[PDB]
Amino acid sequence: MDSVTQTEGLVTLTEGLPVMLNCTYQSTYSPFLFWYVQHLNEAPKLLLKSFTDNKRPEHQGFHATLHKSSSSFHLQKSSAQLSDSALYYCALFLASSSFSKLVFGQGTSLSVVPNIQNPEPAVYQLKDPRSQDSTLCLFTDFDSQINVPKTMESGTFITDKTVLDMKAMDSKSNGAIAWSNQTSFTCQDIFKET
Amino acid sequence: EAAVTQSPRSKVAVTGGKVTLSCHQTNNHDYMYWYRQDTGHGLRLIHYSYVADSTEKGDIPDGYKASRPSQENFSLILELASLSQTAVYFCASSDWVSYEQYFGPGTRLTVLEDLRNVTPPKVSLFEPSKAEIANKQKATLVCLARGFFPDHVELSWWVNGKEVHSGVSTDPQAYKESNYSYALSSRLRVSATFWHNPRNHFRCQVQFHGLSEEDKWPEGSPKPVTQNISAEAWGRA
Amino acid sequence: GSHSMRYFFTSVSRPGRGEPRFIAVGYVDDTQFVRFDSDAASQRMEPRAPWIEQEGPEYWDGETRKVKAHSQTHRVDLGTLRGYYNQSEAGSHTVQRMYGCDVGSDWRFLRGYHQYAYDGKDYIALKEDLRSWTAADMAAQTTKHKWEAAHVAEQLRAYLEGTCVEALRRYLENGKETLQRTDAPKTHMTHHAVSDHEATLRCWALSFYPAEITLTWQRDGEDQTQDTELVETRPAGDGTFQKWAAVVVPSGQEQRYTCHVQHEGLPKPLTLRWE
Amino acid sequence: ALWGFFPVL
Amino acid sequence: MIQRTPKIQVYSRHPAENGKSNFLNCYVSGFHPSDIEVDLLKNGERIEKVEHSDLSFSKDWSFYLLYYTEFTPTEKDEYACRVNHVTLSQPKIVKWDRDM
């Protein structure tokens, strides 16, 4: 009682589609709710307030409406953009009977991915010239809809896909890296099975 | 404005040691707060203060003390650090409109059974594929930091002596390769003709936060102090 | 019947000393139940009624922290106002605040209050609709803008219609033996002969609770409103109240006057004539 | 039960 | 600023009876500002053991206080409430009249 429940985990959304992050709460007294945002390696900051008339406080940007009847305060947007990737906190403000405090949810990570117009999936091998035989494999320029596999064996490691941007001109590039110390097992098979 | 500052920005501590996180705030705010951030727990309040010289227990005060020597300063104190206390800590401040809190940059604390495992990264630079170069007129330089413990690291890129942001994608979180070894990787992609320049000096920089001068270290190896470790390579034909 | 809860705060600036004096008290109807005083040794909310003592340690820590913060706020309020009206620092000044709720006989919310005075004059107040503020001067308009930006009325409504009411019921049921009682006035009349042609008659009302009572004098069935002397209803010290009313009456004309007492405790309104 | 929000003047 | 003179009432808690323990009360109300001096008197001299209520006020913003002390009324002993405020140039004394 006096809690906040958010969408659990990681949300993955393709740029230009509508954002929809769930907040429900339980409150003894009249409900006041707030969304906070944390960009990676930054201070959390205030995004929006549940005040306003009825339940709509902001249009093109993020907005939220309080529905007291089902105790909902869902964060919304019309068109997600890559810069929206961040950690979002839903917060209940308790200042009626108890001393003013915010009660935060567990937060929800939003990850917005590029709509890759012309994909060119390729795996390369790359070499550490200072090291004697230490190699690497890079997978890149693939579609956001594909799944990168997770490593099933020891000594070998594969990263989660990342987005890189070249200023040149809209060169959105999805990328994954993999490596190991296993004697002799090649890049031709590692990035297999979405 | 409303700018809060925290120090240290990072800290490596042993179990049973005394740790003090500091906050500073010049916004003429009477209200300050200390939070801790974890996975599947978000932001939990530990202690707060509504005026200079008083502190109140928050939702999770246990193992922590608090001090407000003046309006500007608010200290969080661990008397006997324990593994449970490894987290990111946030300090925040507000005036009477207390649902609008302004947060500090944060502090990463790691608590360990032993200082022995603390080790700086080994940085490797991996050079582009001829096939990538030929088929697409582009080059992905990959930087790979391995073998480091605590994951208090920042990774920047440097081309021709100046730091660069465009055409770069580092991993958001370090990857765990062993109970005591982390890895962090990043890409640098530039045009074929750019890499093809025998003048176009390249380098990957990893800032590592480790122990401080105060920490005791056995006579054997080098002390895993706060340091930068680079690898570098130039473009070729 | 109907019931109410009220808190009263008084802060006074003390130029001859460092700190302002801050005092806070809580009432349920006409029974005081808690106090806080900035100059007391304890620096805590203290109980003042038997029945608030059954509250736990959690209640006491909470009320103490909230009142100390009320205290700090009103210390700073003193500075702010002295700034608004361009007053110097050498003179003492008073801020008073009051807020609370009323409930009907059904124990449902009827109305709520949140108002301030500065130096005895009204400064700002919550309106009956519980969404608006009344600001008497330009200084108060500055306060009204701060509060509208921070949605204070909406937060207040939350407290007045939820917390204030819920606590009031809680108190009413624990102090049932004290707060839900009704003590009817014990009444009598006294005669005093001022001089050869005139004489004061006093209508006494004693040992009653709650404080609300009505005493009116009549001459030949008619309301003798002006010429009636009415004292402020006064506490006996044991949780009952006292009131009287007097009229200057021509000698020998005593028996043409009637005193009329009205009180919740009283099955029928009483009518007293001198004999 | 006091209020837990503390507006200023 | 607003300055209101206190109204003063000196009375007993119970109907006064000689040799029986009662309480004497001096109730000051309708005043402002709140700084006020109030002593209960027995035959001209100041009674020590005297307690008061916690400062409070009315709707119209004016203050009130209750001063009180245990006393045993007699035939020959006089009691009064002495009061001083900013409005009063001299301390006003009101005698206790049980027969009011």
CA dist B194 and A167 (Å) reads 14
Every domain of chain B and the residues it spans: 3-113, 114-237
Helix (H, G, I), strand (E, B) or coil at B193: helix
Q: Which contiguous run of DSSP H or E holds residue B194?
A: helix B192-195
Asked if the C-beta of B30 comes within 8 angstroms of chain C's C-beta atoms, the answer is yes
Every domain of chain C and the residues it spans: 1-181, 182-270
CA dist C171 and A148 (Å) reads 63
Q: What is the largest CA-CA distance in chain A?
A: 68
Other C-beta atoms lying within 10 Å of the C-beta of residue C51: 19
- Terminal CA-to-CA distance of chain E, rounded, Å? 36
Every domain of chain A and the residues it spans: 2-114, 115-194
Handedness of CA C86, C88, C89, C92 (dihedral sign): negative
Burial of C137 (0-12, 13-18, 19+ CB in 10 A): middle
> b/e per residue, C207-233, with b = 16+ CB within 10 A?
bbbbbebebbbbeeeeeeeeebeebeb
Q: Which contiguous run of DSSP H or E holds residue B49?
A: strand B42-49
Whether the CB-CB separation of E46 and E93 falls below 8 Å is answered with no
Rg (CA), chain B: 22
C1-181 folds as 3.30.500
CA dist B76 and B214 (Å) reads 19
CA dist C23 and C7 (Å) reads 10
User: Which chain A residue has the Cα nearest residue B91?
Assistant: A43
Looking at domain B3-113, its CATH superfamily turns out to be Immunoglobulins (2.60.40.10)
- What is the number of alpha carbons within 13 Å of residue E93 lying toward its C-beta? 11
CA dist B55 and B48 (Å) reads 6
Residues contacting B154, CB < 8 A, separation 6+ = B206, B207
Residues 57-96, chain C, touching A (beta carbon < 8 A): 62, 65-66, 69
Helix (H, G, I), strand (E, B) or coil at B116: helix
CA distance C43 to chain B (A): 12
E near A: at least 3 beta-carbon pairs less than 8 Å apart: no
Residues 147-166, chain B, touching A (beta carbon < 8 A): 166
DSSP structure string for A19-67: EEE-EEE--SSS--EEEEEE-TTS--EEEEE--STTT-----S-EE--B
Whether the CB-CB separation of A126 and A138 falls below 8 Å is answered with yes
CA dist C90 and C241 (Å) reads 40
Residues of A in contact with C163 (CB under 8 A): 29, 96-97
Residues of C in contact with E2 (CB under 8 A): 119-121
Q: Which of B76, B26, B20, B28 is nearest to B48 (CA)?
A: B76
CA dist A9 and A104 (Å) reads 15
CA distance C184 to chain D (A): 30
**Length, in residues, of chain D:** 9
**Length, in residues, of chain B:** 237
Q: Do A99 and B125 touch (CB under 8 A)?
A: no
Q: Do A98 and D6 touch (CB under 8 A)?
A: no
Whether the CB-CB separation of C211 and C241 falls below 8 Å is answered with yes
- What is the number of alpha carbons within 13 Å of residue A173 lying toward its C-beta? 31
For residue A176, what are its two tokens?
Answer: 């994954």
For residue C50, what are its two tokens?
Answer: 């038997």
CA dist B194 and B188 (Å) reads 12
For residue C20, what are its two tokens?
Answer: 């302002």
Q: Do B96 and C150 touch (CB under 8 A)?
A: yes
Helix C57-84 / helix C138-149 crossing angle, nearest 10 deg: 140
CA dist C74 and C58 (Å) reads 25
Beta bridge pairs of residue B126: B142
Q: How many residue pairs bridge chain A and chain D with CB atoms within 8 Å of each other?
A: 14
Interface test with C, best of A34, A96, A98, A99 (most C CBs within 10 A): A96
Q: Which of A29, A3, A1 is nearest to A92 (CA)?
A: A3
Whether the CB-CB separation of A20 and A76 falls below 8 Å is answered with yes
User: In Å, what resolution does this model reach?
Assistant: 2.5
Helix (H, G, I), strand (E, B) or coil at A131: coil
**Phi, psi dihedrals of residue A134, rounded to the nearest 5°:** -70, 110
Supply angle C-alpha B77, B82, B87, rounded to 5: 70
Other C-beta atoms lying within 10 Å of the C-beta of residue E13: 19
Asked if the C-beta of D1 comes within 8 angstroms of chain A's C-beta atoms, the answer is yes
Same fold, A2-114 and A115-194: yes
Residue with tokens 């003709």: B193
For residue C27, what are its two tokens?
Answer: 């009432």
Beta bridge pairs of residue E41: E46, E80
Q: Does domain A115-194 have CATH number 2.60.40.420?
A: no
For residue B167, what are its two tokens?
Answer: 């055409």
CA dist A49 and C77 (Å) reads 27
User: Which chain E residue has the Cα nearest residue C23?
Assistant: E55
Which contacts qualify for B167-173: CB closer than 8 Å, 24 or more apart? B167/A164, B167/A165, B167/A166, B167/A167, B167/A168, B167/A171, B168/A164, B169/A162, B169/A163, B169/A164, B169/A165, B169/A173, B169/A175, B170/A162, B171/A159, B171/A160, B171/A162, B172/A40, B172/A162
Residues 200-219, chain B, touching A (beta carbon < 8 A): none
DSSP structure string for chain C: --EEEEEEEEEE--TTSSSPEEEEEEEETTEEEEEEETTSSS-S-EE-SGGGTTS-HHHHHHHHHHHHHHHHHHHHHHHHHHHHTT--SSS--EEEEEEEEEE-TTS-EEEEEEEEEETTEEEEEE-TTSS-EEE-SHHHHHHHHHHHHTTHHHHHHHIIIIIHHHHHHHHHHHSHHHHT--BPPEEEEEEEEEETTEEEEEEEEEEEBSS--EEEEEETTEE--BTEEEPPPEE-SSS-EEEEEEEEEETT-GGGEEEEEE-TT-SS-EEE---
Chains touching B, CB cut-off 8 Å, 3+ pairs: A, C, D
Asked if the C-beta of C68 comes within 8 angstroms of chain B's C-beta atoms, the answer is yes
Q: Do C163 and D1 touch (CB under 8 A)?
A: yes
Q: How many residue pairs bridge chain B and chain D with CB atoms within 8 Å of each other?
A: 6
> b/e per residue, E25-41, with b = 16+ CB within 10 A?
bbbbbbbbbbebebbbb
For residue C118, what are its two tokens?
Answer: 């500065």
Asked if the C-beta of B54 comes within 8 angstroms of chain C's C-beta atoms, the answer is yes
Asked if the C-beta of A186 comes within 8 angstroms of chain C's C-beta atoms, the answer is no
Whether the CB-CB separation of C78 and C38 falls below 8 Å is answered with no
Q: Which of C90, C56, C69, C59 is nearest to C24 (CA)?
A: C69
Alpha carbon C247 to its chain centroid, in Å, reads 28
- What is the number of alpha carbons within 13 Å of residue C268 lying toward its C-beta? 3
Which contacts qualify for B69-74: CB closer than 8 Å, 24 or more apart? B71/B28, B71/B29, B71/B30, B72/B24, B72/B25, B72/B26, B73/B22, B73/B23, B73/B24, B73/B25, B74/B23, B74/B25, B74/B32, B74/B34, B74/B49
Asked if the C-beta of D3 comes within 8 angstroms of chain B's C-beta atoms, the answer is no
**Among E1, E9, E11, beta carbon nearest to C120:** E1
Rg (CA), chain C: 23
Q: Which contiguous run of DSSP H or E holds residue B57?
A: strand B56-57
Q: Which contiguous run of DSSP H or E holds residue B195?
A: helix B192-195
CA dist B215 and B150 (Å) reads 15
**Phi, psi dihedrals of residue E28, rounded to the nearest 5°:** -105, 130
Q: Do C72 and B30 touch (CB under 8 A)?
A: yes
Q: Which domains does chain E have, with CATH numbers?
A: 1-100 (2.60.40.10)
Asked if the C-beta of B30 comes within 8 angstroms of chain D's C-beta atoms, the answer is no
Q: What is the DSSP letter of B211?
A: B
CA dist C125 and C117 (Å) reads 9
Q: Which of A169, A12, A41 is nearest to B167 (CA)?
A: A169
Q: Which of B21, B7, B6 is nearest to B77 (CA)?
A: B21
C182-270 folds as Immunoglobulin-like (2.60.40)
Looking at domain A2-114, its CATH superfamily turns out to be Immunoglobulins (2.60.40.10)
Q: Which contiguous run of DSSP H or E holds residue B192?
A: helix B192-195
E near B: at least 3 beta-carbon pairs less than 8 Å apart: no
Pairing of strands B107-112, B10-14: parallel
Q: Do A30 and C65 touch (CB under 8 A)?
A: no
B114-237 folds as Immunoglobulin-like (2.60.40)
CA distance C101 to chain E (A): 14
Residue type, E39: D
Pairing of strands C109-118, C94-103: antiparallel
Whether the CB-CB separation of B36 and B90 falls below 8 Å is answered with yes
Whether the CB-CB separation of B98 and D5 falls below 8 Å is answered with yes
Whether the CB-CB separation of A179 and A155 falls below 8 Å is answered with no
**Phi, psi dihedrals of residue C62, rounded to the nearest 5°:** -55, -50
**Phi, psi dihedrals of residue C179, rounded to the nearest 5°:** -85, -25
Alpha carbon B186 to its chain centroid, in Å, reads 16
User: Which chain C residue has the Cα nearest residue E68?
Assistant: C237
Residues 35-94, chain E, touching C (beta carbon < 8 A): 35, 53-57, 61-62, 64, 66, 68
CA dist C162 and A30 (Å) reads 8
The technique by which this structure was obtained is X-ray
DSSP structure string for B117-162: G-BPPEEEEEBPPHHHHHHHSEEEEEEEEEEEBS--EEEEEEETTE
Asked if the C-beta of A70 comes within 8 angstroms of chain C's C-beta atoms, the answer is no
